[PDB]
Amino acid sequence: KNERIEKLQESWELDERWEGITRPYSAEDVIRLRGSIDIEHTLARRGAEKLWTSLHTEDYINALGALTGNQAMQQVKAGLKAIYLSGWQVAADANLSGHMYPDQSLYPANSVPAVVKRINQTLQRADQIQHMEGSDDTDYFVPIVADAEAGFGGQLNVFELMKGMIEAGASGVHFEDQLSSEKKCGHLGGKVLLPTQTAVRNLISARLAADVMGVPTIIVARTDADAADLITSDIDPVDKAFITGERTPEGFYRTNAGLDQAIARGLAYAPYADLVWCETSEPNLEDAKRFADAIHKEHPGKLLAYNCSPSFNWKQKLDEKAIASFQKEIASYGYKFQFVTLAGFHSLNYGMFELARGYKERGMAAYSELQQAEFAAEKHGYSATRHQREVGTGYFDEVAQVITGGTSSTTALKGSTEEAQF
Template sequence: NGIHWFAPIVADAEAGFGGALNVFELMKAMIEAGAAGVHFEDQLASEKKCGHMGGKVLIPTSQAVRNLVSARLAADVMGVPTVIIARTDADAASLITSDVDPSDHEFLTGERTMEGFYGVNAGIDQAISRGLSYAPYADVVWCETSEPNLEQAQRFAEAIHEKFPGKLLAYNCSPSFNWKKKLSEEEISRFQEEIGAMGYRFQFVTLAGFHALNYSMFDLARNYRERGMDAYSDLQQAEFAAEEHGYTATKHQREVGAGYFDEVAQIVAGGAASTTALTGSTEEAQFDSPESPITGLPGSTQNEQFVK
């Protein structure tokens, strides 16, 4: 409709890469780069792990809160109403840097490690405690879980909403979970709808692109070894078929912006440029056909002049 917009980006700020001042500068940089939302987790930055790995070390609750305050201050200074997401890894983290915060005392085990860290009882109770502490300082609260568990998700949501009604929640539908090992097909089918009803309005599959890219390339390579160009032709036909659903990467030259630079060249040359890239290209000759309904770039010279 003539409206130009950018898809909103939610950026991963990890654990802030330091203290509150590092968080402040990082938040400013991410806003300048165009992030609409930024999430921060409560791990020790120097020992940061994926939420589904072992060895995670928490920072005290009060320190994590200071990081959230610092992020909000950065957004205010920049004058941008950025969405702040507070993530806790307390469900699976069994270590903490310090016993300074009374909020963490009930979870301390009394044990110490060779690195000087304190032991804590990992679990949903610890995650709820931290979620309640973070809720006043964040737009969205995210509990990183160890498995896709509806009962656990409901327990966390109810605890947060009891004190903060309507608080937005985030859920990582992670590829680190073995979904069919943990849930039935019926449970998988209704999983997102059910947690959505609980208040988990921001749901995502971390690394979905990584797995899709690697599997599709592996599948093509395996089939190419056995079937040669038939394998690639099948992939290409699948691309053509997907265009009616909005897929646009069949023509890779156009996808990466060749038409844009053709338009620049035409403007500079007063419409008389003879070196435009898409004119005379194989994409123009072979792909602009009823078989490939997606043609050109809307409003561009490629769309107006080069599509036959």
């Protein structure tokens, strides 16, 4: 009890991980909520330590939205150093209700944890295949940054969702300052802000959940206040600077949206978050720098996150040169976690539409074209054209050989069309 608490307090005081982070609660409070034993969360712990290190040693970390394990595995094979788990993509195509939803927190709260677990389990299998074949060359255990939306209710829903993300092996979790019952994609209308004090309580709840689980999980504070021109309540005096006095039929207060409202929220959330994220209506370098300088005046060195959103028309907003240089340029402002939220959705839907249309028009000629493009990608590191090997048929054959002392008559890769034709 003494030792357990003293060790926790010692970690908060000495570890540079917690520099500039406020905890408005004690080590004794955390140990009181932990129960009588510590449960180890190996992937969550390893991932969060690796992510913390990468954010401070890489020029920046660029990720793509992944909604299956296989998408994540190809992202790691292409050389990306983190996976982004979009709640938008989970609403669309990968939630535990099995419905297609817009991005309005309509799906079950345990849906993103479930996909974190799936992704970690695919990466484990990929690691096992590689390890079994004699190398540890590729590091398949890359950090997953997951979308917790507005936490699917109040501060206790936030607490439970943060714990579920850690249980599943997420390295980082983002929370946004929206009223959960009205939650929207950052690039839709009808965004309703929480009071500053409530959004702060959600970030404190996420940190308390991480502390109870015993894992230094990365917390990303997102503000929707650049575009949001509604707030649930006028209760917080710091929000009254932006309130016009008009009320909607629902009782929401209208506000003066813009960079001033977002900077105010960023500065409020910075002491309670590892990274700050400002949603924007277009990919604008000047706005990104303005936001960055505002945070950096009060919290120099504060890590920032940037949504390179497919909700933008990139060629409409930016010239070819500006597009090519965009990520390197914003990284120089402190945007060290950068992610294309819906890359997985667009990859999956475009790929299948074009394939199925080709197939409809030209039958097996369209499918052979795809198989040939796959053979052509092998020299750049693609391996999935050998699908039996990719999903672990070789790993399970070796399991069977260890079980039977190498006598099994029913191993799968020997006598396969893969070994004959590939």
